[PDB]
């Protein structure tokens, strides 16, 4: 009966807004967090006070072994997830010639390897339950490239390509696979010089809110969105 949705990074910002909204939609939210147990608990309590249901889960997304262990156990105990939302991390400009090995490797392995680390333990349980499903990845913002971000652009484009290929793979199981690509989102601590930097590039001349990303994820998660797959959809105020 009940449909469970794992939301990574649901202790803060975009992941928290997604978790709250999907709980409102009726999904049993698995609120994931890395270190911030207080924030995850806050998310879950917000969910419960607005009439929904969920539970916490903890793992470090860059720790593949830990991801597998915690997810396989949570799944063995509670059943396969109907949905998996894989949220993104932050970026830091660095010009390619100046870029160090660690900057390249770290960006690639935190932003691209998390696709495998989080989704591999989750996909076949979802297939085996044969009730369809939903997978939604999120970009750091992937389609266009950006100065000083060859590593983050490679990672984000990689996620997009992995997402689309997996969409082709899982189409026959009635699991939709889509990527959401937000523009500049106001998550509460963004640099002023960042706002200053990009606001003229944004037709709507304003930052997006986390709830605005969550609305798009809520749509993709909904039953009527079952013919939408293999897509990367941007919520960026017209930036691109």
């Amino acid at each position: 009966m009940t449909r469970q949705v794992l939301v990574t990074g649901a202790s803060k910002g975009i992941g928290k807004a997604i978790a709250v909204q999907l709980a409102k939609d009726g999904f049993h939210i698995v609120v994931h967090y890395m270190g911030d147990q207080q924030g995850a608990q806050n998310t879950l309590e917000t969910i419960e006070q607005h009439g929904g249901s969920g539970r916490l889960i903890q793992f470090d997304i860059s720790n593949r072994e830990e991801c597998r262990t915690k997810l396989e156990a949570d799944i063995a105990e509670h059943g396969a997830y109907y949905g998996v939302v894989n949220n993104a991390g932050i970026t830091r400009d660095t010009a390619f010639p100046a870029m160090t090995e660690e900057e390249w490797d770290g960006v690639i392995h935190t932003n691209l390897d998390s696709f495998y680390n989080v989704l591999h333990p989750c996909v076949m349980p979802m297939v085996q339950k044969r009730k369809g499903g939903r997978i939604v990845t999120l970009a750091s913002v992937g389609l266009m490239g950006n100065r000083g971000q060859t590593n983050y652009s490679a990672a984000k484009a990689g996620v997009i390509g992995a997402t689309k290929s997996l969409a082709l793979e899982l189409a026959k199981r009635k699991i939709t696979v889509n990527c959401v690509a937000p523009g500049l989102i106001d998550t509460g601590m963004v640099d002023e010089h960042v706002k200053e930097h990009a606001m003229p590039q944004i037709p709507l001349r304003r930052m997006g809110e986390p709830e605005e990303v969550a609305g798009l994820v809520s749509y993709l998660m909904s039953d009527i969105a079952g013919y939408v797959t293999r897509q990367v959809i941007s919520v960026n105020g017209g930036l691109v």
Copy 2:
């Protein structure tokens, strides 16, 4: 403080499903038709059956002066639309070497010139109400990727995409989102589609519904595909 949404081609198929879903969403639907009054009436009947509301309107999207006259009179009587859904459009499939003048022109006119004919009388009244707004055009996977026998249709729908993105840039400062919905193959009465089925009219309407919703206010200048994974 009712919010009115014009839906062209709403007497049948995708247009009908959009009109019905948006009425369920709480919008007052202006059900447009050209000759299919019976279909339009059935749409409005269903709208009221679900507890919604709306009204009919008649014009030929290809007749620019008729469009302007009827739309401006409707806006005079009831106020400006909050949303416009530009859905009407025909196909005249054929090999390009065999394609006639009529087969080219009719497709361009009904599919692409309707952008100007329907939206031009509607934009400034929308802007002047200073309450934001929504414009959703309809294209096709054909417009994104090309398709044999559809040089005309692919041209017209790709053109709708380009016009839509431009208008998005123009109207963003009034908080009016402008987006385009590109359905794949829709069953309105197959091994190249990953989901291995045709789409349903309601599945197009669901995406139009999302775009018409208040929480979609930061999505603009987009062409979003509901196509089973074709592209």
Copy 3:
């Protein structure tokens, strides 16, 4: 065997550069013009003076019947074209609310209807000659992402791209490739300078392109080794998009 290539709008700028370069490549160029006869003869004289061959043709790409008559007569007399470069176009820039009927219609029916008006008389002869061929349409970055004050131009060029892809699919088995070239901002001379450096910061290369730089990509697509490139829209825009 001589291969004829029609080049619309070849009296000036990009069309001229394409005509001159293709003549250098060895193609017999049909230099088309609408009103600018002297520019077209300038193009043909350049071609001739570097040892190439060509001939003029006149018609208005807006006038479908004139296009058909002139192209059918030229092809009846000289045989089917091997290549067609659909280059000619117009802009009528305006914000959408202020845009007139004629500013919308003129752009759609000159830039987008051109596809049918020029290519329909030319495709079946090309196919019938069973030698393969080349069709290259010219669009714009405006038709890829949209631009303020260009709902009409963006629509027409996006439409050109969609038609190009569909025709590519129809003709692929005929060994005719069909592609679209999308230039960025090209220095055609006398280009308005406010427009110019308003556009400079969007262009990574921090310069406008040269007509020869567009002609070089058309020249590549026209070449035999490009026979596996079709259904593509290729941008020459200094990294704009």
Copy 4:
């Protein structure tokens, strides 16, 4: 006077590119990892037809080997004018069955490639102040796979890296583009793949390596200096 590194030039597309770019007049650095026979023949063919070049060996998966060999080669001969970074061969694996090693290995070979080969080359190029050309090579467009999430992730990542680097080096008159071939007849193509793919290809034939090399030749050419940040597909209409 203008040197071009061509990785994977011992065979197939890489060989075709090396041969053609040498006919265009570039001095080709013919790279190989294990296929020394093939690279020797690539260089010998170049020289027989009146061109010039030299061999270089390294494993593109070994960042250290790449850096040492490329820095040494550049120190002796000066920075490359062009770098062509070719792609490996694809493999089917359903995502559920895919192993840690299949994922990590494809990312490491097909994506980290970008850093391992290009990073030693970019700043020297910039410092020579003669402009330059970088071309990455993505096999794309096919339908009906049993899964290629890792290869498609790496190829999409290469495209993103390429476009971003294009943005960085635009000011330096260095163009950076990606070429995405369809199904190319390298002589080692599975019969099953030919059968399944051909009805999806409007041209109804595989491409020839020389048809990819012609597009690389165009991008390397001086007249192509206004083409940058692009992915250009040579695929017979596949997509």
